[PDB]
A paper describes a structure:
Human carboxylesterase 1A (hCES1A) was employed as a target enzyme for inhibitory activity (IC50) screening due to its conservative catalytic serine residue. By the analysis of X-ray crystal structure, human CES1A has a serine esterase catalytic triad (Ser-221, His-468, and Glu-354), such catalytic triad is conserved in all mammalian species.. Herein, the halogen effects on the reactivity of the halogenated 2,2,2-trifluoroacetophenones as serine-targeting covalent warheads were investigated. Our results showed that introducing halogen atoms, especially Cl or Br, into the phenyl scaffold would influence the electron density around the ring, which led to different time-dependent inhibition response to the target serine hydrolase (hCES1A).
The covalent interactions were evaluated by nano LC-MS/MS, which offered powerful evidence to support the formation of the covalent adducts and well-explained the time-dependent inhibition of these covalent fragments. Chloro-species compounds F-3 and F-4 were chosen to detect their covalent binding sites on hCES1A. Since the activity of electrophilic warheads and the formation of covalent adducts are related to temperature, we set the incubation conditions at two different temperature points (4 °C and 25°C, respectively). This analysis certainly found several allosteric binding sites, although no expected result of any compound covalently binding to Ser221 at the catalytic cavity of hCES1A. Successfully, the co-crystallography of hCES1A with F-3 and F-4 provided promising covalent binding modes at the catalytic triad. Notably, the co-crystallisation of the parent compound F and hCES1A failed to result in similar covalent interactions. This further proves that the halogen effect may promote the formation of covalent adducts by changing the sensitivity of the electrophilic warhead. The introduction of halogen atoms, particularly chlorine, into the phenyl scaffold enhances the benzocarbonyl reactivity in forming hemiacetal adducts with serine. Co-crystallography analysis not only verified that halogenated molecules preferred to form covalent adducts, but also provided the conformational information for the design of covalent inhibitors targeting to hCES1A protein for the treatment of drug-induced acute enteritis.
Residue numbers in the entry: 4 to 536
Amino acid sequence: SSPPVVDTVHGKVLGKFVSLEGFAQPVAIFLGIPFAKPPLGPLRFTPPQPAEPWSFVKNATSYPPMCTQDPKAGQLLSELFTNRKENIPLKLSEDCLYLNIYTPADLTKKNRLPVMVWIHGGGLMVGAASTYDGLALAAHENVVVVTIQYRLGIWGFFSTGDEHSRGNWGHLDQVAALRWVQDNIASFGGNPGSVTIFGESAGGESVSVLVLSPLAKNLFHRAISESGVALTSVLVKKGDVKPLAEQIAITAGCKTTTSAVMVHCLRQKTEEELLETTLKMKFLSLDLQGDPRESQPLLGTVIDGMLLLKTPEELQAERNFHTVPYMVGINKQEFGWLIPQMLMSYPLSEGQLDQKTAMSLLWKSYPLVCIAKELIPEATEKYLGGTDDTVKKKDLFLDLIADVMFGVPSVIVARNHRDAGAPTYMYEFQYRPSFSSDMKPKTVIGDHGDELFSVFGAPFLKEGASEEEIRLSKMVMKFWANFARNGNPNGEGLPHWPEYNQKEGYLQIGANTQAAQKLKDKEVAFWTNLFAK
Ligand SMILES: *[C@@](O)(c1ccc(Cl)c(Cl)c1)C(F)(F)F
Ligand SMILES: [Mg+2]
């Protein structure tokens, strides 16, 4: 039947129908809609500008390029995280400010469905919207799914610390995409007055940053951070960002005479030269050469004065953030496998860890955990000191890193959000998907990213899910879309999910799903005391 054609502010777009067996209404899919002007040439390291209007009908049936990034790490992460049966290879380009739309609405009728805007993870250095197929979630839960892209790495986050390159270009792109959704999603059957932003890892940190940003006012109405938050420190630069900028400029062949000189020089480099620079910097890899206090594993969020006016901690203390319903979740083993072993090349192949090697490694982990050298012994002893079994010590070390990067920051964010009067919900996800890499030990459960397969309905798109895994995905999708509808995940036939209030109820999600109380309470107390120094 006739492919769907939709009028947007800037012109008409042509999509395609895709049926999911068992659902009468095919899903209308629109791939590669631009939400900004391509940030090329002089527009590099500047805020996104509106897309230019087009005559006639734009064909939105091909996946867009992904933003320039390490193609090997980008393809690997896509393969590890995709919910599709086969991973789709993607082109690289600086021309990447696109979004993809999956709408289950019958576009010949009138519809105002809740909108779910996905912000992908990747450390702010890698990733793509097209990795995530919105078909199953859209059809199963009657929501419009929008997957967005945003500038990454040098292109998205290069900052001189001053007005010549403030930084946070990729977060400004996320804001631009949400403004586009406000202005256009009703033409796709979506309700611009019910937009939920959700994301995982750096995407969850981005959601948290948008909750803290005045630029995102009135652009969304619920938020979900999965395994990432603004207090995940490795993603937020405090203090002097000039050394990293100078290192990047020097690696690219640029002089560092002034900030304006550095930025102008970098704007003259080709995409290929800046990718060469990216690869020479060896981001996302644990840096084992030199003082770990000088390690820079990624270019990330800064306090730029436009998107973020103060540090997340200061904004939280001032209660200066958007008090929307907010779901904050973590996985049982955030540092269990994928980040250390696939993304960061951790020296941990051997599977036993003695306490001296653990202390040395935790010092090398400074860019991730920020533990002063004098505090390494106490932190290591707290986690590892209770056993002499060095296999158990390795597992407990992985727990330590997971608590510092994800668990404690997540609970602190949730507590501060709750204390501003906003409806707050928390979860801890514990499941080992059958879609896990064959390289992943069978004992790793609730690894970073494991909930994605449930959220995005992989059991309905990939082969070989058990019946338990199918049930888990339907329940998770319903909770998520109930939250998008109502700011409360609860509903008929679902386990009760208590609000994260003074009792600190949270939902343990897995093969058995049930409410629990006080997530990470002792750990928060320990690490808050330790970091108070
Ligand atoms: C996520 O975006 C992420 C990667 C690396 C690091 Cl250090 C952090 Cl804090 C988050 C993802 F890549 F998805 F794992
Ligand atoms: Mg070094």
